[model samples]
Target: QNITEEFYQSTCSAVSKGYLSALRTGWYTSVITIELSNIKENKCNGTDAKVKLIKQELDKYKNAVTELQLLMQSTPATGSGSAIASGVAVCKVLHLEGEVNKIKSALLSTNKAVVSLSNGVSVLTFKVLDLKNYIDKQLLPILNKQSCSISNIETVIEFQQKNNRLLEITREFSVNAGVTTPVSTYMLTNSELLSLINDMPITNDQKKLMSNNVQIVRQQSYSIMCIIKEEVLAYVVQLPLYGVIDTPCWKLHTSPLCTTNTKEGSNICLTRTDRGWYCDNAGSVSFFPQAETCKVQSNRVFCDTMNSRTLPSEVNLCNVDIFNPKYDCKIMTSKTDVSSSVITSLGAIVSCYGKTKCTASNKNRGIIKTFSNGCDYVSNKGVDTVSVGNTLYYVNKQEGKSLYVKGEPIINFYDPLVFPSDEFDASISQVNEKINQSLAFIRKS
Candidate 1:
């Protein structure tokens, strides 16, 4: 029996539905708590009706948890194929029990508070608020963790099933090709087959068998001859590290500087500039030169490259030197290929120039502004606006000096532009007139 089909049909779907129903009930309880808090009632008698509603929601939550517990206790008939799936479900339910208990305790406290509102409306309000905070800060995080864990387990099962089916078909093809062969077989391409073989978590013996059979098919038939290549041999030979298989091995090539010989020392070569030893030649193919020195160096290079590849090109909310000053030191949505530590060190500058006050200086002009966060208006004297949230603050300059806002110099304007506006002119006059009209209207009212 196919393990994937049997497992999904017997227990996986049931477990999924059970978990989903429990999560829905948990969220529903959270909503009821919010509703309780939103009740605009100062007197104890006003809360009598809401107390009943809380208890009803709590009943649904308790029933959902009990059903999940029952599902965990029940031992469905487990065949060889279905055993793994059954075990996975039990383990997940057991882990979920801790989170369930936390929610239950919080709900009970909320329920008791609502029922005893006669103590005071203030006490009831505080209790409900505490429950809401607990749900947001504690319960939601655990729920997210459980959801991700379940998703990862399902993905593993899917890959395992695919690998098992591939191996079974390859074994059948090897033993009785003449009788079992189809007239028009749908074949996986070389890359597709290699990817499956690399990803398979089977024993070394099984991997070797699959590799050899694929090679035999490639040599014996013209139609599927390209299914396996010389690289597959090297892949099968290398042992897995720490019980986890390495990714597909890089194709090995003969180096011109060294000769193929294990007994002779001519197989290794020392680089002239870097003083690094590399394998020049080896008879048997491998990911790198088979010589000891070459293998060690190559491993280092390969590991470094892989580590670098793992980081995302652009990190969110990280301080890095790559950002352009023109864009207010803010990361543009269209930018790419940048990375930084998630949190900056103490006294480190962050990308908050436009969004908040930050310092910038013009050494050439002997100008320093400790609070600059926008594009500088080029001129010796002018007004520039720096936006912070909904407010745009004014920064002005005089006699090509440091920019000033609110009677203090806090900005640097390095570039200058031609403008024909006089100091304290048309714009200010209009603003003053509007303020007077508003004040007059207020006086009349």
Candidate 2:
């Protein structure tokens, strides 16, 4: 109430709502308002009591994140699933579980506090935003510049889950399992990275280096650091993301068709194997084997039901030549019927990652006019891959060949490399599997 409306003293009494309600309802002139002491700043609450209470409650959330960081640094790399020390991922899930608990706890506390104040239960909003796997907002030409340890991805996922924010990542090549994609890719399995994290000797080395101060470059760092180098390096190694252009990082997410499947079979677009086409296990491919299969001879042709060996090779199978003047099979992607999505370059996809750089008539467009239906081919780049947005690209296997564009090969000191197989890298699959397992466990709680 404004003091000017009627003559009143600076200080007023704080009365219970029951008394105040009766007076305000025409029972009495009863004007009531909490007056603040000169020492207090805000006149509304009359004291900082509510602020202190909320801060105290928020501390619980801080403690959860802090605890998770500690767990990441201390947990081992293997078998951590059974216990917190099994693997980096196991340790990560424990941390993640803490995060979810923290949010739930915070909301619960907020609700109780509102009731305690004798106020109507009001709707409160809690936002749990995640940025772990987000694309870099800043533009940088750093290729494979975003690797991270297996534990890192798991920990990120855990935090996201706790905060109610998450989007799953895929293998570099986008395939489920093969020599490349592990069973862990499809389902959560105990991870091996937790052991690797533990493998790091948390010696006084950090102390020695930081005799005064040093950057603890690993994933978890309490002393002081600028980067999570280990996790960053590992992440880029297996899941190199689209480069930073004008595009927001969220737009970087691609499809699982790279590894959309999880069985131990050959993928047409990502692998090179004879008769791998058409499910050899089911004899589904019959006559559509790769060009190499053309050598199999007429007797081996699918003339006989036994020759085809499949229940109905005639159904899904078709000759690529059918698409030419007859019908061109060049557009046929794989035996698995998939109405693939049409992907334009990052420019077309986000309209942002395109114009960050301009040189030589946009000679290096660095954008995909369109994403052909296929997967990565493991171009031989040693420890480094050339990331053409939404796709993993690498130089040819043999190095010393001058790499060029538009009828020219430009040779560089190190050949660009990329893991072209559509399978999820074993390391990441192990981590993801562990997270899924942990999430399943959390629901039980």
Candidate 3:
């Protein structure tokens, strides 16, 4: 049970992963749908109009994958051979879903990061305009004046040359950041970023700071634009903990036949079904049904006891097999491979055990056994024993009911032996053992 149950739990974990992945996939698919909705709600231009067909196709694929995953989750893990088999499909679907989200993450993050960087560049361009205002409006004329640097004429020329170079770079930045912004709007290529970086006039004294800023931006952009790490995160989170019906030795219609009796180490004495009772007929050994002493025949008939009958038609007796009634078992461990014969034998017992009760309406004069629950089964019939107005009768048809009935009892019939008795001794032990093992599995976590 422990081994089987561990496999079952692992199966559940797998399915759970699928379920979570489906959710994430569905969410990302919805985002694409929303994007298309906005496109149709307004006028489309350039990429929006040109790629509408592609996005719709992309949306179609997402929807299909999402539905497929939903179907996978709804299906039982037990369906595809083993629960483990179902788990394999589940994990596959989940992995596919993780990739779906990964693709979406990469697309949208790159799209948004481009917008962030463009905004940053526009801010940079405005700062350049501010620098222009400070230089042309306040410093250029004053610094070039002979009155201010008359003794340092060459120094003034050098200062003006530097300012002119700065102005030229600033103008270039503004054009790239504003008018030529279309050069790289939705997505700024690496070359465009490098061009921007190269022309920025950060001096060698401040080169370290500029390099750090550029590296930071690139790192931030990659973090936002790619899903390598994000996909791993989503994959791990969405994975499931994935169980149900175990393999059956046999089945009655849709019901399972218990395994305790058939398995080698089982100890159950009887196996029951709705049809009749069954006892394990051990190989090479004859088993006897419970019997009692009685006398109802010409020679003052006898029973298990050698004594003769005291009354001509009435006899009282005690059950010989009533000492030990209930026999339950706990199956500590079980064989992975069980014999077909063993399972068949146990199936027979369980099936018959279920139909142990008399038909109650065997108006054809079939005898009801006076066994333990047999008495209650009949007593519960009220006045209608065999059928309405039919007489309730008993006979010592120990040769089996198909044979003639020797007689009927004047008093209420009672077999006195407990229902199970020693019939299912081996089967009971096996069943109880399995029960304990199952409980242990349940209590584990």
Candidate 4:
């Protein structure tokens, strides 16, 4: 959702902000985790391929997180521990990740953030040499070879400050034997994002933005905790409306496990005009039975002279009706699109946005819409999803709404920056450039 307070209420550009204010933290990479848990497919039932894609996407985040943490921890802390911790904690809150992150946001003001960060260890004690460590380690040597007087220490700092990633995301979780408590521990190692090609990380310029930018980031840390206003009236152009239906409960609509039995609302009956079969599962199938004899699966089964197998499958009655399969829901609507008539009454939830166009298309919104053109600017390099696979990078996950903090952008832990990779380096660089450019725009003294 592009409904963020900042996004909705105000907008800024790199040319204006000038530069992102410096938090004075060390160099570390970023990672992104595309969460698909709550997102859904537009297909009435959903797509198996889409589901598989989401599972793969999760692995991407898990793996990316692992590598960046290594880089952060391995880079000798200029003032490690609290500084890094507070900065990380600060970004978490400023970005407005969520409830858990929101709770951790206040830690930005405390030394606990630094302590926690300093305590971070590598993924494991026996891991092999990491790619990022090699780069940072070579920073001084390379610079020296070029006749640069800068030491490895200076080189590393400069390298880190050039970029703004929270650090790597990995899948492996570690355990400690020396510690008495059995709490799960995560570690960071000096690692590079191979997924990002030649694009290496440099020092971040946190103080580059306008005075108000930092304030916004700071305020957003707490503002994110506030509950937002929301309405369920399919206002966007995504998903289908009443595409699927189940009786009674109104899952997709009111499929009413059709059963014309001895009960009132027990086993309602449905009718499909095609093959003539009854179903009570509540799903709105493509085939609706024409004129069904729905009833509870009691004596009604053998009484009407139907197969005993035709019982309700459960205990109550049987739903005997003609099949009426329809793909009615073609748009998404928060409110029901119902209408009335004299002879035949037909409730409405008419289509709002097309199934394909469900993804947002606001040029200003970037990729916030629910719809996905399936264009992977990173891994695919110059090629988009359309070139490699005819299928679009249709989002298997549901689109997320933006949270406003009145000033800053609500960056979730899952946002793109947290999950940087070699494949998307070019794109990431461009984005950071824009962010930095905005920071530089502020009226500096």
Identify the candidate with maximal lDDT. Answer: 1
lDDT of each: 0.24, 0.22, 0.23, 0.22
In angstroms, how far off is 173's CA in candidate 1? 40
lDDT of 2: 0.22
Model 4, 1-445: lDDT tens digits are: 1111111111110000011111211223222111111122121233344333433443443344444334323433233233234333433332332432322332334311211222242110111112234333543244333233323345344434322122211222111111111111112111211211112232122122212132222221110011111100000000001111222210011210111123332221111112222233322212222222222211111011121123233311111111112221111111111111111011111111112342222234354423222111111112112211122332112122322213321112112222222221132234345546655665352
Which lDDT value does model 4 have at 430?
A: 42
lDDT of 1 by residue, 92-134 (tens): 3324334323333445554322111221211111111232344
**Local error of candidate 3 at residue 422 (angstroms):** 15
**Model 4 stretches astray by more than 4 angstroms:** 1-137, 140-158, 161-252, 255-445
Q: Which stretches of candidate 3 lie over 4 Å from their true place?
A: 1-50, 57-233, 237-445
Query: Candidate 3 lDDT, tens digit per residue, 1-445?
Result: 1111000110000000000000000100001101111112122242432234333443443343343334334433222233123223323433443443433444543321111121122101101112223334443444343333223344334434434433333243233321111122123334444444444444453333323344233322210011112212111001111010011111111111222233343322222222111111111111112222121121111121111112211100001111124322211212222111111111101111222332333334454332221111222222123321122333211111111112221111212122122332244344444456656776886
When summed lDDT is taken over every stretch of 10 residues in candidate 4, the lowest stretch is: 231-240
- State TM-scores per candidate: 0.14, 0.16, 0.16, 0.15
